[PDB]
């Protein structure tokens, strides 16, 4: 409703770096808000794409950002009559970023990994890796839970069970308020998908550089399955956390699996031991239900509510015709221990191929009326097809069915404006929470400041 669309703030990275693919707010030890922006195709040392992370200080005029430097050198360790190898070329560092306390987690989902033992090998595969930085101190650490040292023949002899070679850990990420990092790995267990969790503090204290294969004892991974419904489901394409079982001492995990059960798509709510509590099945095949998930309480009863994006949903129109527009589903958590029910609201896109629902960002309370609100992206929507961000206001019964405000893309065609969203933080310290929108196709981030309601 009250985001200012006139005086925007633009930050920009290098050309072709895909600056703005991911972003998040970051507060330092003194509570000063910055923006952390991932750029997954920034050039490395050998003039090859490796990705990179930028830490932008808040300035109303915007501009360029300093780099949050990570090591981009390939690594080799000859130990235990084996050879460990990490390949950071086209690893995509900055394809997801997330902030917790004064720590930044940047992940490279396509970092490759191989183990050589004479004439055998593990196979060079994208296990993924994440990089952790404490900018104020300079501390650095890595976390790569899917790295193994098992040779390729063993997997064949055991029918490819527990095969974490193509995890792509860091594809999606989130951090519980207690400080547990949860990584989505859609390719784990031969493209079923897995989750990996470990406390940030234990990632830092158990990491030493050059070890390449180290244990993190407090870490916890999900489990393989023989159920065909999970095959090629990409369990972990999107991840989120929330409170869904009534017990406040437990944190629950929300996991998107947009090709679950032969591209039906699904979202599951689990406990921290990855035991399943509820499962939201998709509505239409290939709609990519579960592409994006969001957790926030919209109706103000203190019970977290769930949102799920299906950006390829095809709306039925006259003359038996279908129109890919994208759809968002709202599920309101009921009172006490009961399953989540049918959707309380359906939001369907307007523009053909607009991909409404590609990103869903909680805004906090934007108009300060007592109900939390959200922003939904349609990165190829709008009457010009340049991109649109739609704001929906919370209310006692759920969400309003019509948007209160629409942000049209200030960038040219192909910018993918809205592909990444993040709200619910007040960056200019005016009492109202603000919204940052990424446009990786234009290598830019736009900051929308909320202002008092007119």
């Amino acid at each position, epitope marked *: 409703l009250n985001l200012d669309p006139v005086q925007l703030t633009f930050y920009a990275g290098p050309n072709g770096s895909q600056f703005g693919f991911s972003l998040d707010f970051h507060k330092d030890s003194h509570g000063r808000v910055a923006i952390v922006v991932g750029a997954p195709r920034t050039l490395g040392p050998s003039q090859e794409e490796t990705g990179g992370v930028f830490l932008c200080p808040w300035r109303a005029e915007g501009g360029q950002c300093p780099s949050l430097l990570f090591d981009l050198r390939d690594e080799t360790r*000859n*130990v235990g009559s084996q050879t460990l190898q990490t390949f950071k070329a086209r690893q995509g560092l900055g394809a997801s970023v997330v902030s917790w306390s004064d720590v930044i987690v940047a992940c490279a989902p396509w970092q490759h990994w191989n183990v050589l033992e004479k004439t055998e090998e593990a196979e060079k595969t994208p296990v993924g890796s994440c990089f952790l930085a404490q900018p104020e101190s300079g501390r650095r650490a890595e976390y790569s839970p899917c790295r193994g040292n098992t040779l390729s023949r*063993i997997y064949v002899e*055991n029918d490819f069970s527990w095969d974490k070679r193509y995890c792509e850990a860091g594809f999606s990420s989130v951090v519980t308020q207690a400080g547990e990092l949860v990584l989505g790995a859609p390719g784990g267990y031969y493209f079923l998908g897995l989750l990996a969790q470990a406390p940030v503090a234990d990632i830092f204290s158990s990491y030493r550089p050059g*070890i390449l*294969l*180290w*244990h993190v004892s407090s870490q916890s991974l999900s489990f393989d399955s023989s159920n065909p419904e999970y095959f090629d489901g990409y369990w972990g394409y999107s991840v989120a956390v929330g409170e869904f079982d009534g017990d406040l001492n437990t944190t629950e995990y929300v996991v998107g699996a947009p090709t679950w059960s032969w591209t039906l798509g699904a979202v599951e709510i689990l406990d921290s031991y990855y035991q399943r509590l509820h499962r939201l099945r998709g509505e239409q095949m290939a709609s990519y239900f579960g592409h994006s998930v969001a957790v926030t309480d919209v109706n103000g009863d203190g019970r977290h509510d769930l949102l799920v994006g299906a950006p390829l949903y095809m709306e039925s129109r006259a003359d038996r015709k279908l129109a890919e527009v994208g759809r968002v589903y709202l599920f309101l958590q009921p009172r006490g221990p009961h399953a989540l029910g049918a959707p309380s609201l359906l939001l369907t896109g307007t523009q053909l191929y607009g991909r409404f629902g590609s990103a869903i960002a909680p805004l906090g309370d934007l108009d300060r009326d007592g109900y939390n609100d959200i922003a939904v992206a349609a990165p190829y929507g709008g009457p010009s097809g340049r991109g649109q961000v739609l704001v929906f206001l919370g209310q006692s019964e759920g969400l309003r069915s019509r948007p209160s405000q629409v942000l049209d893309s200030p960038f040219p065609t192909g910018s993918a404006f809205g592909f990444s969203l993040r709200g619910a933080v007040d960056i200019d310290d005016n009492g109202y929470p603000d919204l940052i929108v990424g446009a990786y196709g234009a290598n830019q981030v736009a900051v929308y400041r909320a202002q008092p309601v007119v």
Partner: antibody, heavy 119, light 108 residues
Framework: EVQLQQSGAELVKPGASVKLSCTASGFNIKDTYVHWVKQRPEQGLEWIGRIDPANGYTKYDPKFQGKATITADTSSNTAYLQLSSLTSEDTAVYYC????????????WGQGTSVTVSS | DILMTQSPSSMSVSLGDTVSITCHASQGISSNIGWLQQKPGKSFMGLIYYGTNLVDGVPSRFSGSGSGADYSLTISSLDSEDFADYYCVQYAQLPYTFGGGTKLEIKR
């Protein structure tokens, strides 16, 4: 806390067999490799072999192929070292080891099991 | 197999001294070396892993250094508890091999 609680000292005859145990305390035996090391006063420390209790695959120093047989039962969270056709020279103290962080290191040691071979 | 030549066999030193044990391998092992401690009539304790890294709980007076095929454990200011046996172990290759051993004995 991590602790490795081994079996009590064994007293056995030459030609017989003995199966030492190494029980994990405060953690899952499935987490890391588990190694076995043999200590003698003159000869010193010798590496017997290792097992990954997550799958059961083992490695051995060729010197010990035949005598030593390393096994692991995830259930009771215990690893085993089985010695066969015992001899005077098998009289030694046997430790089980696991690494702290590094996959390939030797950082946490059990108290040691004393084996004596004699008629 | 890789040969771990550990010197000296023993040394008689006093409290507060700064001493240094060395270890030399038959080939390069690129810091893949560990340092152990065996207090008299007791089991083993890990001191170092991967050349220089301290095992959790070990006092900072211990320190590992070295490279290629020559490494050095060092104790700054000996404590009464530090008088024990010390071994190096390589894990650059299977089979793992140990050093001969080094006893720290009280000087008088």
């Amino acid at each position: 806390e991590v602790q490795l609680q081994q079996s009590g000292a064994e007293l056995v005859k030459p030609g017989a067999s003995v199966k030492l145990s190494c029980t994990a305390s405060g953690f899952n035996i499935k987490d890391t490799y588990v190694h076995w090391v043999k200590q003698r006063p003159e000869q010193g420390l010798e590496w017997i072999g290792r097992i990954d209790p997550a799958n059961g695959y083992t490695k051995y120093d060729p010197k010990f192929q035949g005598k030593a047989t390393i096994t692991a039962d995830t259930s009771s969270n215990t690893a085993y070292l089985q010695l066969s056709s015992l001899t005077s020279e098998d009289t030694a103290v046997y430790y089980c080891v696991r690494p702290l962080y590094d996959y390939y290191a030797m950082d946490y040691w059990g108290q040691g099991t004393s084996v004596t071979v004699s008629s | 197999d890789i040969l771990m030549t550990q010197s000296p066999s023993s040394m008689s030193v006093s409290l507060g001294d700064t001493v240094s044990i060395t270890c030399h391998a038959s080939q390069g092992i690129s810091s893949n070396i560990g340092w152990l401690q065996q207090k008299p009539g007791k089991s083993f304790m890990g001191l170092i892993y991967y050349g220089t890294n301290l095992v959790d709980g070990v006092p900072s007076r211990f320190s590992g250094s070295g490279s290629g095929a020559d490494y050095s454990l060092t104790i700054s200011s000996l404590d009464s508890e530090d008088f024990a046996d010390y071994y190096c172990v390589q894990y650059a290759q299977l089979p793992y091999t140990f050093g001969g051993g080094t006893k720290l004995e009280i000087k008088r």
